[PDB]
Short mmCIF file of C-alpha atoms and ligand atoms in Angstrom, two decimals:
data_model
loop_
_atom_site.label_atom_id
_atom_site.label_comp_id
_atom_site.label_asym_id
_atom_site.label_seq_id
_atom_site.Cartn_x
_atom_site.Cartn_y
_atom_site.Cartn_z
CA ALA A 1 9.80 20.42 -11.70
CA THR A 2 10.50 18.64 -14.98
CA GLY A 3 8.48 18.96 -18.23
CA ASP A 4 7.38 15.30 -18.00
CA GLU A 5 5.57 15.88 -14.64
CA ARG A 6 3.67 18.80 -16.16
CA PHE A 7 2.87 16.97 -19.41
CA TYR A 8 1.52 13.88 -17.64
CA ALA A 9 -0.44 15.78 -14.96
CA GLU A 10 -1.94 18.61 -17.08
CA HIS A 11 -2.44 16.87 -20.43
CA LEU A 12 -1.80 13.14 -20.98
CA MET A 13 -3.43 11.60 -17.89
CA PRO A 14 -6.57 13.80 -17.92
CA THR A 15 -6.98 13.15 -21.67
CA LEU A 16 -6.60 9.34 -21.31
CA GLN A 17 -8.94 9.31 -18.28
CA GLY A 18 -11.51 11.11 -20.45
CA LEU A 19 -11.19 8.26 -22.99
CA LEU A 20 -11.08 5.17 -20.76
CA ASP A 21 -13.40 3.88 -18.03
CA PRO A 22 -11.68 3.46 -14.62
CA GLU A 23 -11.25 -0.34 -14.65
CA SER A 24 -10.10 -0.39 -18.30
CA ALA A 25 -7.60 2.33 -17.38
CA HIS A 26 -6.37 0.24 -14.39
CA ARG A 27 -5.97 -2.85 -16.58
CA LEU A 28 -4.01 -0.90 -19.24
CA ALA A 29 -1.80 0.69 -16.56
CA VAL A 30 -0.91 -2.77 -15.22
CA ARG A 31 -0.19 -3.98 -18.80
CA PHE A 32 1.95 -0.94 -19.70
CA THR A 33 3.85 -1.15 -16.42
CA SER A 34 4.54 -4.89 -16.80
CA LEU A 35 5.87 -4.34 -20.34
CA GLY A 36 8.18 -1.52 -19.17
CA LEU A 37 6.58 1.05 -21.52
CA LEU A 38 6.71 3.69 -18.72
CA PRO A 39 8.86 6.89 -19.10
CA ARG A 40 12.54 6.95 -18.01
CA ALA A 41 12.82 7.56 -14.25
CA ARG A 42 15.37 10.38 -14.00
CA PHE A 43 15.68 10.65 -10.18
CA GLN A 44 18.72 8.87 -8.71
CA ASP A 45 18.10 8.03 -5.03
CA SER A 46 20.37 9.89 -2.61
CA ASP A 47 21.63 8.34 0.65
CA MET A 48 19.28 10.73 2.58
CA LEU A 49 16.31 8.63 1.41
CA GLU A 50 17.61 5.23 2.57
CA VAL A 51 15.68 3.65 5.48
CA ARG A 52 16.53 0.48 7.44
CA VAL A 53 13.40 -1.14 8.90
CA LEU A 54 11.53 -4.54 9.05
CA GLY A 55 14.91 -6.36 8.70
CA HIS A 56 15.59 -4.70 5.35
CA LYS A 57 17.26 -1.75 3.60
CA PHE A 58 14.87 0.42 1.55
CA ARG A 59 16.65 2.56 -1.11
CA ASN A 60 13.86 5.14 -0.78
CA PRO A 61 10.80 5.26 1.46
CA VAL A 62 8.14 5.60 -1.30
CA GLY A 63 6.22 2.41 -2.12
CA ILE A 64 3.32 1.43 -4.32
CA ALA A 65 0.31 0.54 -2.15
CA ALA A 66 -1.66 -2.71 -2.45
CA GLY A 67 -4.44 -2.77 -5.04
CA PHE A 68 -2.53 -1.57 -8.08
CA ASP A 69 -0.77 -4.88 -8.80
CA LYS A 70 -3.28 -7.25 -7.19
CA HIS A 71 -1.89 -10.36 -8.88
CA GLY A 72 1.89 -9.72 -8.97
CA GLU A 73 2.06 -8.98 -12.72
CA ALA A 74 4.00 -5.69 -12.77
CA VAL A 75 6.55 -5.90 -9.93
CA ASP A 76 9.66 -5.22 -12.02
CA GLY A 77 7.99 -2.35 -13.93
CA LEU A 78 7.09 -0.75 -10.59
CA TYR A 79 10.74 -0.77 -9.45
CA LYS A 80 11.65 0.73 -12.85
CA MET A 81 9.15 3.55 -12.07
CA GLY A 82 11.29 4.41 -9.02
CA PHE A 83 9.35 2.88 -6.11
CA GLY A 84 11.61 1.94 -3.18
CA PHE A 85 9.41 -1.08 -2.46
CA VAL A 86 6.45 -2.86 -4.02
CA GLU A 87 3.41 -4.36 -2.33
CA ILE A 88 1.25 -6.78 -4.33
CA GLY A 89 -2.24 -7.99 -3.48
CA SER A 90 -4.58 -8.40 -1.88
CA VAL A 91 -4.38 -12.09 -2.79
CA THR A 92 -7.12 -14.52 -1.73
CA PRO A 93 -6.61 -18.28 -1.26
CA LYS A 94 -8.88 -19.37 -4.13
CA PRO A 95 -9.40 -17.30 -7.29
CA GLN A 96 -12.47 -15.07 -7.16
CA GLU A 97 -14.11 -12.57 -9.43
CA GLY A 98 -14.89 -9.74 -6.96
CA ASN A 99 -17.93 -7.45 -7.35
CA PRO A 100 -19.90 -6.75 -10.58
CA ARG A 101 -18.65 -3.96 -12.93
CA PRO A 102 -18.60 -0.98 -12.60
CA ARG A 103 -16.76 -1.09 -9.27
CA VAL A 104 -14.20 1.76 -9.47
CA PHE A 105 -15.05 5.44 -9.84
CA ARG A 106 -13.06 8.63 -10.32
CA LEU A 107 -13.86 11.83 -8.38
CA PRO A 108 -11.69 14.22 -10.42
CA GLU A 109 -12.87 17.37 -8.57
CA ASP A 110 -11.68 15.79 -5.30
CA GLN A 111 -8.52 14.10 -6.60
CA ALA A 112 -10.12 10.95 -5.14
CA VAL A 113 -11.21 7.44 -6.17
CA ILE A 114 -13.95 5.21 -4.77
CA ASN A 115 -13.55 1.46 -5.29
CA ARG A 116 -15.54 -1.63 -4.41
CA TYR A 117 -13.44 -4.27 -6.22
CA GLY A 118 -14.24 -6.86 -3.52
CA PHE A 119 -10.87 -8.73 -3.62
CA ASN A 120 -10.82 -9.75 -7.29
CA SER A 121 -7.88 -12.15 -7.19
CA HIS A 122 -6.10 -14.72 -9.36
CA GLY A 123 -5.63 -16.68 -6.12
CA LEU A 124 -2.61 -17.95 -4.21
CA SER A 125 -1.53 -20.65 -6.68
CA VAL A 126 -1.36 -18.35 -9.71
CA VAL A 127 0.46 -15.61 -7.76
CA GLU A 128 2.85 -18.18 -6.19
CA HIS A 129 3.95 -19.37 -9.63
CA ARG A 130 4.27 -15.79 -10.91
CA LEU A 131 6.53 -14.87 -7.98
CA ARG A 132 8.50 -18.13 -8.21
CA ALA A 133 9.41 -17.27 -11.83
CA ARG A 134 11.39 -14.23 -10.54
CA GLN A 135 12.23 -15.32 -6.97
CA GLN A 136 16.02 -15.07 -7.36
CA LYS A 137 15.75 -11.79 -9.25
CA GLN A 138 13.70 -10.54 -6.25
CA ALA A 139 16.33 -11.82 -3.80
CA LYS A 140 18.92 -9.64 -5.58
CA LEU A 141 16.55 -6.63 -5.68
CA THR A 142 15.86 -7.03 -1.94
CA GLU A 143 19.60 -7.21 -1.18
CA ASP A 144 19.93 -4.04 -3.31
CA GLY A 145 17.39 -2.19 -1.12
CA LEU A 146 14.23 -2.94 -3.11
CA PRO A 147 11.98 -5.15 -0.95
CA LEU A 148 8.71 -6.89 -1.83
CA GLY A 149 5.55 -7.01 0.26
CA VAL A 150 2.60 -9.38 -0.22
CA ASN A 151 -0.83 -8.41 1.01
CA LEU A 152 -3.15 -11.27 1.98
CA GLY A 153 -6.94 -11.28 1.85
CA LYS A 154 -9.71 -13.77 2.44
CA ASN A 155 -12.26 -15.34 0.12
CA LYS A 156 -15.88 -14.12 0.12
CA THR A 157 -17.33 -17.55 0.95
CA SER A 158 -14.70 -18.85 3.40
CA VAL A 159 -16.03 -20.17 6.71
CA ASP A 160 -12.73 -19.69 8.59
CA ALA A 161 -10.99 -16.30 8.10
CA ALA A 162 -7.91 -17.22 10.13
CA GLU A 163 -7.35 -20.32 7.98
CA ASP A 164 -7.49 -18.17 4.80
CA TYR A 165 -4.71 -15.93 6.18
CA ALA A 166 -2.75 -18.95 7.42
CA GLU A 167 -2.84 -20.43 3.88
CA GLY A 168 -1.53 -17.11 2.52
CA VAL A 169 1.35 -17.16 5.00
CA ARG A 170 2.27 -20.72 4.05
CA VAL A 171 2.04 -20.18 0.28
CA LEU A 172 3.33 -16.60 -0.25
CA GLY A 173 5.23 -16.01 2.98
CA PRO A 174 8.34 -17.75 1.56
CA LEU A 175 8.35 -15.33 -1.39
CA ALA A 176 7.82 -12.08 0.58
CA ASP A 177 9.99 -9.68 2.56
CA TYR A 178 6.86 -8.75 4.47
CA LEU A 179 3.29 -9.97 4.61
CA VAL A 180 0.24 -7.82 5.27
CA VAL A 181 -2.78 -9.12 7.12
CA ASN A 182 -5.40 -7.04 5.48
CA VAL A 183 -8.27 -6.85 7.92
CA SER A 184 -9.41 -3.42 6.66
CA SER A 185 -11.01 -3.74 3.24
CA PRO A 186 -14.41 -2.04 3.36
CA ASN A 187 -15.58 -4.30 0.46
CA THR A 188 -15.79 -7.74 2.07
CA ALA A 189 -18.71 -8.36 4.49
CA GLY A 190 -17.53 -8.88 8.09
CA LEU A 191 -13.83 -8.35 7.26
CA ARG A 192 -13.33 -5.21 9.37
CA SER A 193 -14.77 -6.98 12.46
CA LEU A 194 -11.46 -8.95 12.47
CA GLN A 195 -9.90 -5.69 13.76
CA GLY A 196 -11.71 -6.25 17.12
CA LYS A 197 -9.52 -7.29 20.10
CA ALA A 198 -10.51 -10.95 20.69
CA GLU A 199 -10.81 -11.82 16.97
CA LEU A 200 -7.56 -10.02 16.10
CA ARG A 201 -5.56 -11.70 18.90
CA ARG A 202 -6.74 -15.18 17.84
CA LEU A 203 -6.19 -14.42 14.12
CA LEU A 204 -2.73 -12.89 14.57
CA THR A 205 -1.54 -15.64 16.96
CA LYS A 206 -2.33 -18.19 14.20
CA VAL A 207 -0.69 -16.02 11.50
CA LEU A 208 2.46 -15.55 13.57
CA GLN A 209 2.66 -19.27 14.42
CA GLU A 210 2.50 -20.08 10.69
CA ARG A 211 5.14 -17.45 9.86
CA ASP A 212 7.46 -18.69 12.61
CA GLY A 213 7.23 -22.20 11.08
CA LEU A 214 8.89 -21.05 7.83
CA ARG A 215 12.62 -21.57 7.22
CA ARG A 216 14.79 -18.60 8.31
CA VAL A 217 15.61 -17.36 4.77
CA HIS A 218 11.89 -17.50 3.91
CA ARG A 219 10.53 -15.89 7.08
CA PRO A 220 8.81 -12.54 6.34
CA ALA A 221 7.94 -9.66 8.65
CA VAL A 222 4.19 -9.58 9.43
CA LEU A 223 2.25 -6.29 9.38
CA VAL A 224 -1.43 -5.54 9.99
CA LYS A 225 -3.20 -3.04 7.72
CA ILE A 226 -5.87 -1.04 9.46
CA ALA A 227 -8.81 1.15 8.55
CA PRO A 228 -9.00 4.95 8.95
CA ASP A 229 -12.51 4.50 10.44
CA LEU A 230 -11.63 2.90 13.77
CA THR A 231 -12.93 4.13 17.10
CA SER A 232 -10.44 5.24 19.77
CA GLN A 233 -11.27 1.94 21.54
CA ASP A 234 -10.45 -0.08 18.40
CA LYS A 235 -7.08 1.66 18.06
CA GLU A 236 -6.15 1.09 21.73
CA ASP A 237 -7.05 -2.60 21.33
CA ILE A 238 -5.01 -2.99 18.13
CA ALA A 239 -1.99 -1.32 19.77
CA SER A 240 -2.30 -3.64 22.80
CA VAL A 241 -2.50 -6.81 20.64
CA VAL A 242 0.40 -5.65 18.40
CA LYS A 243 2.63 -5.20 21.45
CA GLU A 244 1.43 -8.40 23.21
CA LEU A 245 2.14 -10.56 20.12
CA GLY A 246 5.22 -8.80 18.71
CA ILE A 247 3.59 -7.96 15.33
CA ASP A 248 6.35 -6.44 13.21
CA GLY A 249 4.54 -3.36 11.95
CA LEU A 250 1.38 -1.56 10.88
CA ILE A 251 0.11 -0.22 7.55
CA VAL A 252 -1.96 2.88 8.21
CA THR A 253 -4.39 3.23 6.46
CA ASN A 254 -6.72 1.50 4.04
CA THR A 255 -9.52 3.43 2.29
CA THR A 256 -12.31 5.18 4.19
CA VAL A 257 -16.04 4.35 4.24
CA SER A 258 -16.59 7.91 5.47
CA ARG A 259 -17.56 10.66 3.02
CA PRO A 260 -15.96 13.86 4.35
CA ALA A 261 -18.05 16.98 4.02
CA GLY A 262 -17.05 18.91 0.90
CA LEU A 263 -16.69 16.13 -1.70
CA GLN A 264 -17.70 17.48 -5.11
CA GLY A 265 -17.45 14.46 -7.41
CA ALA A 266 -20.76 13.40 -8.94
CA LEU A 267 -19.94 9.83 -7.81
CA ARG A 268 -19.33 10.69 -4.13
CA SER A 269 -22.22 8.55 -2.89
CA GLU A 270 -21.11 5.34 -4.63
CA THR A 271 -20.52 2.46 -2.16
CA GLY A 272 -16.86 1.63 -1.48
CA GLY A 273 -13.58 2.83 -0.02
CA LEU A 274 -12.53 6.39 -0.69
CA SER A 275 -8.86 7.12 -1.45
CA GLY A 276 -6.75 10.14 -2.46
CA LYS A 277 -6.71 13.71 -1.16
CA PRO A 278 -9.88 13.53 1.06
CA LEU A 279 -8.32 10.61 2.98
CA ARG A 280 -4.91 12.25 3.43
CA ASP A 281 -5.23 13.91 6.82
CA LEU A 282 -7.48 11.26 8.33
CA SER A 283 -4.67 8.78 7.51
CA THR A 284 -1.94 11.08 8.88
CA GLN A 285 -3.84 11.47 12.15
CA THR A 286 -4.28 7.67 12.39
CA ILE A 287 -0.49 7.26 11.94
CA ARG A 288 0.06 9.82 14.67
CA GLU A 289 -2.30 7.98 17.04
CA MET A 290 -0.85 4.51 16.37
CA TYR A 291 2.76 5.73 16.76
CA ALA A 292 1.94 7.22 20.19
CA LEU A 293 -0.02 4.12 21.31
CA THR A 294 2.92 1.87 20.35
CA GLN A 295 5.54 4.19 21.91
CA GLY A 296 7.29 4.64 18.55
CA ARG A 297 8.52 1.02 18.81
CA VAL A 298 6.41 -0.46 15.97
CA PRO A 299 7.31 0.46 12.35
CA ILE A 300 4.45 2.12 10.45
CA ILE A 301 3.98 2.28 6.69
CA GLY A 302 1.91 5.44 6.14
CA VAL A 303 -0.56 5.52 3.26
CA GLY A 304 -3.54 7.63 2.17
CA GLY A 305 -3.54 10.70 -0.06
CA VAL A 306 0.23 11.05 -0.59
CA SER A 307 0.85 13.11 -3.73
CA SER A 308 3.84 15.33 -2.85
CA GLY A 309 6.99 15.43 -0.76
CA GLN A 310 5.09 17.48 1.84
CA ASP A 311 2.41 14.77 2.10
CA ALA A 312 5.15 12.13 2.54
CA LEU A 313 7.06 14.16 5.15
CA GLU A 314 3.92 14.88 7.15
CA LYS A 315 3.32 11.14 7.49
CA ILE A 316 7.01 10.47 8.33
CA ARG A 317 7.00 13.22 11.02
CA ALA A 318 3.73 11.75 12.36
CA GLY A 319 5.48 8.39 12.80
CA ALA A 320 5.72 6.57 9.45
CA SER A 321 9.04 4.90 8.61
CA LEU A 322 7.92 4.38 5.01
CA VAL A 323 5.05 5.69 2.87
CA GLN A 324 2.97 4.32 0.00
CA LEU A 325 0.84 5.89 -2.69
CA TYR A 326 -1.65 4.70 -5.25
CA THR A 327 -4.40 7.21 -6.10
CA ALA A 328 -1.90 9.98 -6.95
CA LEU A 329 -0.34 7.69 -9.60
CA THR A 330 -3.77 7.27 -11.20
CA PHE A 331 -4.12 11.05 -11.61
CA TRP A 332 -0.59 12.31 -12.29
CA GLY A 333 0.99 9.20 -13.82
CA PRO A 334 4.51 7.77 -13.38
CA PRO A 335 6.31 11.15 -12.91
CA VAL A 336 4.61 11.56 -9.49
CA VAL A 337 7.09 9.04 -7.99
CA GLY A 338 10.19 11.12 -8.84
CA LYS A 339 8.27 14.25 -7.84
CA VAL A 340 7.53 12.96 -4.33
CA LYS A 341 11.12 11.79 -3.83
CA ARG A 342 12.72 15.03 -5.06
CA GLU A 343 10.37 17.18 -2.94
CA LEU A 344 10.89 14.96 0.09
CA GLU A 345 14.67 15.26 -0.16
CA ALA A 346 14.41 19.09 -0.51
CA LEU A 347 12.11 19.38 2.52
CA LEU A 348 14.30 17.15 4.70
CA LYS A 349 17.25 19.49 3.93
CA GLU A 350 15.09 22.58 4.58
CA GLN A 351 13.94 21.26 7.96
CA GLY A 352 17.48 20.29 9.04
CA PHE A 353 17.10 16.50 8.94
CA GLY A 354 20.17 14.44 8.04
CA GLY A 355 17.86 11.94 6.33
CA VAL A 356 14.46 10.21 6.44
CA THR A 357 15.42 8.23 9.56
CA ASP A 358 15.97 11.42 11.58
CA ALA A 359 12.50 12.69 10.68
CA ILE A 360 10.53 9.55 11.73
CA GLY A 361 8.16 10.56 14.52
CA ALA A 362 9.75 14.07 14.80
CA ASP A 363 6.42 15.76 15.56
CA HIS A 364 6.13 13.70 18.77
CA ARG A 365 9.47 15.10 20.01
CA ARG A 366 8.64 18.81 19.33
C1 FMN B 401 -8.65 0.75 -6.84
C2 FMN B 401 -8.06 0.41 -5.48
C3 FMN B 401 -7.86 -0.93 -5.13
C4 FMN B 401 -7.32 -1.23 -3.87
N1 FMN B 401 -7.10 -2.51 -3.50
C5 FMN B 401 -6.52 -2.83 -2.30
C6 FMN B 401 -6.25 -4.21 -1.88
O1 FMN B 401 -6.50 -5.17 -2.66
N2 FMN B 401 -5.69 -4.41 -0.67
C7 FMN B 401 -5.37 -3.39 0.17
O2 FMN B 401 -4.85 -3.63 1.28
N3 FMN B 401 -5.60 -2.09 -0.13
C8 FMN B 401 -6.15 -1.77 -1.32
N4 FMN B 401 -6.37 -0.44 -1.68
C9 FMN B 401 -6.01 0.60 -0.72
C10 FMN B 401 -4.63 1.20 -1.00
O3 FMN B 401 -3.63 0.21 -0.75
C11 FMN B 401 -4.39 2.38 -0.05
O4 FMN B 401 -4.43 1.89 1.31
C12 FMN B 401 -5.45 3.50 -0.19
O5 FMN B 401 -5.93 3.63 -1.54
C13 FMN B 401 -4.89 4.84 0.34
O6 FMN B 401 -3.80 5.29 -0.46
P1 FMN B 401 -3.95 6.33 -1.70
O7 FMN B 401 -4.80 7.47 -1.16
O8 FMN B 401 -2.53 6.73 -2.01
O9 FMN B 401 -4.59 5.57 -2.84
C14 FMN B 401 -6.93 -0.13 -2.95
C15 FMN B 401 -7.13 1.20 -3.32
C16 FMN B 401 -7.68 1.49 -4.55
C17 FMN B 401 -7.87 2.95 -4.92
C1 9BU B 402 -1.66 3.26 -19.52
C2 9BU B 402 -2.24 4.65 -19.17
C3 9BU B 402 -1.51 5.69 -18.59
C4 9BU B 402 -0.18 5.61 -18.18
O1 9BU B 402 0.13 5.79 -16.77
C5 9BU B 402 0.36 4.67 -16.03
O2 9BU B 402 0.58 3.59 -16.59
C6 9BU B 402 0.35 4.79 -14.49
C7 9BU B 402 -1.07 5.09 -14.00
C8 9BU B 402 0.93 3.53 -13.83
C9 9BU B 402 -3.68 4.94 -19.55
C10 9BU B 402 -4.66 4.43 -18.50
C11 9BU B 402 -4.90 5.46 -17.38
C12 9BU B 402 -5.43 6.87 -17.71
C13 9BU B 402 -4.73 5.05 -16.06
C14 9BU B 402 -4.94 5.81 -14.89
C15 9BU B 402 -5.80 5.05 -13.86
C16 9BU B 402 -7.14 5.39 -13.59
O3 9BU B 402 -7.72 6.43 -14.23
C17 9BU B 402 -7.89 4.70 -12.63
CL1 9BU B 402 -9.52 5.19 -12.30
C18 9BU B 402 -7.35 3.63 -11.94
C19 9BU B 402 -8.21 2.88 -10.90
C20 9BU B 402 -6.03 3.25 -12.21
C21 9BU B 402 -5.38 2.10 -11.46
O4 9BU B 402 -4.19 1.90 -11.63
C22 9BU B 402 -5.27 3.96 -13.16
O5 9BU B 402 -3.98 3.60 -13.40
O1 ORO B 403 -10.51 -5.24 -3.33
C1 ORO B 403 -11.00 -4.23 -2.80
O2 ORO B 403 -12.21 -3.88 -2.94
C2 ORO B 403 -10.25 -3.40 -1.82
C3 ORO B 403 -9.51 -4.00 -0.81
C4 ORO B 403 -8.91 -3.15 0.15
O3 ORO B 403 -8.21 -3.63 1.07
N1 ORO B 403 -9.11 -1.83 0.07
C5 ORO B 403 -9.87 -1.29 -0.92
O4 ORO B 403 -10.06 -0.05 -0.97
N2 ORO B 403 -10.45 -2.07 -1.85
#
């Protein structure tokens, strides 16, 4: 490990977290990232890390999860940090404020965060114009193996959820390599009920019809992002609908409304979704389940508690073609990205994989 990893993780990040409230810290991180003030990313991506999935090349399989760059303000800075792909959002159709502050909480003793942002969003129009300002730059980045995802949400007061997602497809679909139908936020009343069979089939049929209506060059993959808190029945139903409709992939998982035994943080009983280390294995097991239920035929982006190459490889072997992280970045800072990639490469070599692709779903073949 480099000196930068150690300096950020042991000294700089904990010191700055001691000085700044969580949401102020988030806002500054977005600002710093957008301005390119981040440290120099030393790690040069080897060919072993390249993945071809969702109609795209990914230079490396480590992405930034939704919720960091909600409004598409820091996309280029995130690629500079060494992410293989960037997901922005969630974006709602109309601007909305989200929940009252405070609404994000650190659990340092658990290496976890709880948030109840409630889809604070600049709205589709603002994000559309922000992405349009760099659309050709993104086209080159995508061609270079650096794709962009856009995660779509719904407004608090909307009377037609499916129409909110349809609007998102129409407005941001033409600017995205993939879209995410986020039906798994724990912070919007009734949202997770859209994961149910009948509601999901009707919602996703409408989303896919809208996507299919876009011009070929502007036609994104469509993925559904699911909760870690689903029943076995819920998961079976989602798998069935995904296969019936030809949904392009799954993002597994969002934050958990569970509070695993053993959390130590003083703020453990705050309302919201829990992320970071306590979510890690719940997410990995959900990936494993969804891979098996879809016969390994549906690409999965694995997310929840990834902080190391081992964490990444466990999700890949469970069935993820790509992984994302967020909470680890908040604790260990920008050097965590290079750390995960370097460790992942080393472990792939150690376990006799030719590359990431060879390891996808490997546990199921043991
Ligand atoms: C502060 C915060 C805000 C988030 N906002 C969103 C969001 O807007 N949309 C979304 O799909 N997921 C959101 N997430 C969930 C992350 O994308 C990810 O699924 C989850 O945090 C698990 O990954 P992690 O343990 O690496 O953070 C958010 C997570 C956090 C911690
Ligand atoms: C600009 C700062 C550190 C530099 O590191 C970064 O920019 C990384 C996090 C992208 C200081 C602000 C801090 C300590 C941010 C860490 C942090 C946080 O402490 C918390 Cl709680 C959250 C929710 C976020 C969301 O991104 C977060 O980034
Ligand atoms: O905006 C939020 O509250 C949010 C959305 C989401 O999908 N997941 C999450 O943990 N928080």
